């Protein structure tokens, strides 16, 4: 089998700039190297075939270029919607096989989150349950860290992270963090407490709640 | 085990870039030199500095 | 469609084959069907799994 | 305009049987090759099989020989893939995607994917609880509101606001996988402030496995 | 990085 070998594995660029991607063939591949576009949450999109030909609709700032068993993907002007991953593949023989794939993300001005904090439902309390919500909205760079306490003593193990992707309009992230206790866990603490550092603030802010106020 | 190599590549108009590399370290490190050969062609003589044990670099271009 | 001798045999092997279920009978039958040119294979990975859950 | 469409994907036992179909429209299948490629977090992008449907003749990818067929029915312009004994390695999404139209040389057209699940873990719907907006969730003029859509099994879950009339301000959170072998997620939007109470806000929250849809309106606390 | 059903992107760590 021929494999593809895909560098960088992550590449960070601002608006404008012009960036590139490389694909190594472990042996002669000819011309029949592809490269496709995955955008979240969608299929792969054809951008390049025959190594350097553009695919109908494609913009002309995509370009591909081949040297021997070495293939190249360049973004002249990289824009806020080439955000996405890149992969490459060759068809010069059966099985065509694909590269790893380098994910593309956007550099921009550093962004400090709104925090927010969640109780947990009335409704979910019906049922022995009760998640908290820490929501971190539309910061820059992704780096962060949300410590929960609960009545001031610090938690660990019993909270779950989730990111956004990159947002389509100002090249941002979000996050969610959510604290999963017993209903008999939540009914007996009081404060509820978010603590968020980020490059943005100046220093952590601390988001809180006490069980049962409005 | 495998490594990720961190790379600053700083263009000569004063822009930069991040890029990492995994594998293992020797895999990574013959990676990234590949890398900064290919964009020297077009980006001018490249430069690399290694820091943190030769896990993080600043590859320079010249132009 | 009709068969070849061959192709007749190995719908029977799988037919008979005591330790599949019948969703995993059927499935193979059906790839039989879909595939001529990998009656062996589908054959054989059919064996496999009745040898499995012996 | 050219379209492949997967079906059949689901929850499937190790050992069980799936059977995918790929409806093409806007060309026929018998002047291309159809191929079946899965996506998945072990092995990335990887080609399954392929056909050419004027001739029938096929190729496989080592790894399911013998146990996924694909094949073609020219007069309903459809490809399929018959998956026989399955394994958790092929959890995936499986796209189909013709090779060789218009005289392309390269996958021109993907469908939007079937996802497979092999586990042997059972279907279970999704409990959906309101992140009501509150003095806690406003800064700035504009307030966060959302719904937690709680311990479901298999993926996915798809989550629209208003019917899909409210895309803006909303950020919805990849699903985790929870230690008790179910997933999560949230979906929050954030709002005028001085919307709420106004401005009715839902979100629509369907899971197609276990039958599932909810229609949840989101509101402020009562105190 | 590791492909996500959840959105479809690589997540790298
Ligand atoms: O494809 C739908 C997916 O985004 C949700 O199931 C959440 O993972």
Redesign the pocket.
Same mark, same amino acid.
């Given at each position: 089998d021929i494999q593809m070998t895909q560098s960088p594995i992550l590449l960070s660029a601002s608006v404008g700039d012009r960036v590139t991607i490389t694909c190594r063939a472990s042996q002669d591949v000819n011309t029949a190297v592809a490269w496709y576009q995955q955008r979240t949450?969608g299929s792969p999109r054809l951008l390049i075939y025959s190594a350097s030909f553009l695919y109908s609709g494609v913009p002309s700032r995509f370009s591909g270029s081949r040297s021997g068993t070495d293939f190249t993907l360049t973004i002249s002007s990289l824009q806020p919607e080439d955000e996405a991953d890149y992969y490459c593949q060759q068809h010069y023989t059966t099985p065509p096989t694909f590269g790893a794939g380098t994910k593309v993300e956007i550099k921009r001005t550093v962004a400090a989150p709104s925090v927010f904090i969640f109780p947990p439902s009335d409704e979910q309390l019906k049922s022995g349950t009760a998640s908290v919500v820490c929501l971190l909205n539309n910061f820059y760079p992704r780096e962060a860290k949300v410590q929960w306490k609960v009545d001031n003593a610090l938690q660990s193990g019993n909270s779950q992270e989730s990111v956004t992707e990159q947002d389509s309009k100002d090249s941002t992230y979000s996050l969610s963090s959510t604290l999963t206790l017993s209903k008999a866990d939540y009914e007996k603490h009081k404060v509820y407490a978010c603590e968020v550092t980020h490059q943005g603030l100046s220093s952590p802010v601390t988001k809180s709640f006490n069980r049962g106020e409005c | 085990s495998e490594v990720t190599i961190k790379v600053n590549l700083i263009f000569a108009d004063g822009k930069i870039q991040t890029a990492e590399f995994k594998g293992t370290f020797e895999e990574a490190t013959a990676e990234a030199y590949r890398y900064a050969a290919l964009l020297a062609k077009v980006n001018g003589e490249y430069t690399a500095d290694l820091e943190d044990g030769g896990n993080h670099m600043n590859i320079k271009f010249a132009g | 469609g009709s068969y070849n001798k061959d192709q007749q045999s190995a719908f029977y092997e799988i037919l008979n084959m005591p330790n599949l279920n019948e969703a995993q009978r059927n499935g193979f039958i059906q790839s039989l069907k879909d595939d001529p040119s990998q009656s062996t294979n589908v054959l054989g990975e059919a064996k496999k799994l009745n040898e499995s859950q012996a | 305009e050219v379209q492949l469409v997967e079906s059949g994907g689901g929850l499937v036992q190790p050992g069980g049987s799936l059977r995918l179909s790929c409806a093409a429209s806007g060309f026929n299948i018998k002047d291309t090759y159809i191929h079946w490629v899965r996506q998945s977090p072990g092995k990335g992008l990887e080609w399954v099989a392929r056909i050419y449907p004027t001739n029938g003749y096929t190729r496989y990818a080592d790894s399911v020989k013998g146990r996924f067929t694909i094949s073609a029915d020219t007069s309903k312009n459809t490809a399929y893939l018959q998956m026989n004994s399955l394994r958790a390695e092929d959890t995936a999404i499986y796209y189909c995607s013709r090779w060789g139209g218009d005289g392309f040389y390269a996958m021109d057209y993907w469908g939007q994917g079937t $996802?497979v699940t092999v586990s042997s873990a059972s279907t279970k719907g999704p409990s959906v609880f309101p992140l009501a907006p509150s003095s806690k969730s406003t800064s700035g003029g504009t307030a966060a509101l959302g719904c937690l859509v709680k311990d479901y099994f298999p993926?996915?879950? !798809?989550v629209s606001w208003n019917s899909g009339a409210l895309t803006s301000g909303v950020h !919805?959170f990849?699903?985790v996988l929870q230690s008790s072998g179910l997933?999560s $997620?949230s979906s929050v939007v954030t709002v005028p402030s001085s919307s709420l109470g106004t401005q009715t806000y839902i979100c629509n929250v369907n899971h197609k496995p276990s039958n599932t849809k909810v229609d949840k309106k989101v509101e402020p606390k009562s105190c | 990085c590791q492909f996500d059903?959840?959105?479809x992107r690589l997540r790298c760590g």
């Amino acid at each position: 089998d021929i494999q593809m070998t895909q560098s960088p594995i992550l590449l960070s660029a601002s608006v404008g700039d012009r960036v590139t991607i490389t694909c190594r063939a472990s042996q002669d591949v000819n011309t029949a190297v592809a490269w496709y576009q995955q955008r979240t949450n969608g299929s792969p999109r054809l951008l390049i075939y025959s190594a350097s030909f553009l695919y109908s609709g494609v913009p002309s700032r995509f370009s591909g270029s081949r040297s021997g068993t070495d293939f190249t993907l360049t973004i002249s002007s990289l824009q806020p919607e080439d955000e996405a991953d890149y992969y490459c593949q060759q068809h010069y023989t059966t099985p065509p096989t694909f590269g790893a794939g380098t994910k593309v993300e956007i550099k921009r001005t550093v962004a400090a989150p709104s925090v927010f904090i969640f109780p947990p439902s009335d409704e979910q309390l019906k049922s022995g349950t009760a998640s908290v919500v820490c929501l971190l909205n539309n910061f820059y760079p992704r780096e962060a860290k949300v410590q929960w306490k609960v009545d001031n003593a610090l938690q660990s193990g019993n909270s779950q992270e989730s990111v956004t992707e990159q947002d389509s309009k100002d090249s941002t992230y979000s996050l969610s963090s959510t604290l999963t206790l017993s209903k008999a866990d939540y009914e007996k603490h009081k404060v509820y407490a978010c603590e968020v550092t980020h490059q943005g603030l100046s220093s952590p802010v601390t988001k809180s709640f006490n069980r049962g106020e409005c | 085990s495998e490594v990720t190599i961190k790379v600053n590549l700083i263009f000569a108009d004063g822009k930069i870039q991040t890029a990492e590399f995994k594998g293992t370290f020797e895999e990574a490190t013959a990676e990234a030199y590949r890398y900064a050969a290919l964009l020297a062609k077009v980006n001018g003589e490249y430069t690399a500095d290694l820091e943190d044990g030769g896990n993080h670099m600043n590859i320079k271009f010249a132009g | 469609g009709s068969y070849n001798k061959d192709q007749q045999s190995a719908f029977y092997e799988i037919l008979n084959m005591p330790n599949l279920n019948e969703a995993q009978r059927n499935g193979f039958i059906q790839s039989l069907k879909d595939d001529p040119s990998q009656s062996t294979n589908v054959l054989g990975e059919a064996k496999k799994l009745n040898e499995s859950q012996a | 305009e050219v379209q492949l469409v997967e079906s059949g994907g689901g929850l499937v036992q190790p050992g069980g049987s799936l059977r995918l179909s790929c409806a093409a429209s806007g060309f026929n299948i018998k002047d291309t090759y159809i191929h079946w490629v899965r996506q998945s977090p072990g092995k990335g992008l990887e080609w399954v099989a392929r056909i050419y449907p004027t001739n029938g003749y096929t190729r496989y990818a080592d790894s399911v020989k013998g146990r996924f067929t694909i094949s073609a029915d020219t007069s309903k312009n459809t490809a399929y893939l018959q998956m026989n004994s399955l394994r958790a390695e092929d959890t995936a999404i499986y796209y189909c995607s013709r090779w060789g139209g218009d005289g392309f040389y390269a996958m021109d057209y993907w469908g939007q994917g079937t $996802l497979v699940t092999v586990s042997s873990a059972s279907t279970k719907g999704p409990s959906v609880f309101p992140l009501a907006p509150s003095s806690k969730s406003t800064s700035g003029g504009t307030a966060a509101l959302g719904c937690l859509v709680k311990d479901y099994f298999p993926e996915p879950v !798809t989550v629209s606001w208003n019917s899909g009339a409210l895309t803006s301000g909303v950020h !919805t959170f990849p699903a985790v996988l929870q230690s008790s072998g179910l997933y999560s $997620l949230s979906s929050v939007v954030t709002v005028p402030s001085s919307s709420l109470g106004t401005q009715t806000y839902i979100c629509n929250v369907n899971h197609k496995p276990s039958n599932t849809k909810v229609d949840k309106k989101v509101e402020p606390k009562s105190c | 990085c590791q492909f996500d059903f959840s959105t479809x992107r690589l997540r790298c760590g």
